[PDB]
């Protein structure tokens, strides 16, 4: 399954003036473009090698679309402040996520077009791409206006047409990068706890994509209900890391095995410390 997704953030900042406006595009959870109103000459920019084949009409049109979007978001921030009757000198956030999930056959799996105001759901295009979930009265007011403007029809045209078409083009152009798999490299560490037992920590490093399953086993039985597990985190070079740990009796460490499952592995890994 594949996705094209844009993540848009507009932040009002009274007293310094005009909102900070950003726009980050991902293909299959891989960043490939960005826009930042705080650049000295703000414009759409490549953030992956493969998108750089696009002609300058692509970059000029995306720059203009971002700047146009920035205009709408400036208006929306004023509209929201009034509808929620918020104080005039404060900073507020309008977020927007839009995109398409498609199978290999190119069928649209799910289109998204949803907004949040100060961190909570505001309005969201439903999966039928004809109706809106509106969280409160201000967003219900927005929905009535969008219903009589035919917005859903026309956003759905983007999600079913231009979004799928460009995704399909991106997967051809960026095939070697997006479909790459990087297998985890794993090791187990050990540290005596002040309590008198032992922490075994199973590391997975250098893997892509981010989806991974780490489990500890004690003579073949899963210890999910007794393990610690960090949020998967970016290494900064395009790979990810994660670890999982268990607390074990000193002297029984060799009974415990780490299990690493990742799409880049031909067979799951099994590691011990003793």
């Amino acid at each position: 399954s594949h996705s094209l997704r844009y993540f848009v953030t507009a932040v009002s900042r009274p007293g310094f003036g005009e909102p900070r406006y950003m726009e980050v595009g991902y293909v299959d959870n891989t960043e490939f473009v960005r826009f930042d109103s705080d650049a000295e000459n703000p414009r759409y920019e490549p953030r992956a090698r493969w998108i750089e084949q696009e002609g300058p009409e692509y970059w000029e049109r995306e720059t203009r679309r971002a700047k146009g979007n920035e205009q709408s978001f400036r208006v929306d921030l004023r509209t929201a402040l009034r509808c929620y009757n918020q104080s005039a000198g404060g900073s507020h956030t309008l977020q927007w996520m839009a995109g398409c999930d498609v199978e290999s056959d190119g069928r649209l799996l799910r289109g998204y077009w949803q907004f949040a105001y100060d961190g909570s759901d505001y309005i969201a295009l439903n999966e039928d791409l004809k109706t809106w979930t509106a969280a409160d009265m201000c967003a219900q007011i927005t929905r009535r206006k969008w219903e009589q403007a035919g917005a859903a029809e026309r956003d759905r045209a983007y999600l079913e047409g231009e979004c799928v078409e460009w995704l399909r083009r991106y997967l051809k152009n960026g095939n070697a990068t997006l479909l790459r798999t990087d297998p985890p490299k794993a090791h187990v560490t050990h540290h005596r706890r002040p309590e008198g037992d032992v922490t075994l920590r199973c590391w997975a490093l250098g893997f892509y994509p981010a989806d991974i399953t780490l489990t500890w086993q004690l003579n073949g039985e899963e210890l999910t209900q007794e393990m610690e597990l960090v949020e998967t985190r970016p290494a900064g070079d395009g790979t990810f890391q994660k670890w999982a740990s268990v607390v074990v009796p000193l002297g029984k460490e060799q009974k415990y095995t780490c299990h690493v499952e990742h799409e880049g592995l031909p067979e799951p890994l099994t590691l011990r410390w003793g």
Partner: peptide
Amino acid sequence: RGPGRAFVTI
């Protein structure tokens, strides 16, 4: 390519 708000404001 990304989506346009097209001055369809909230």
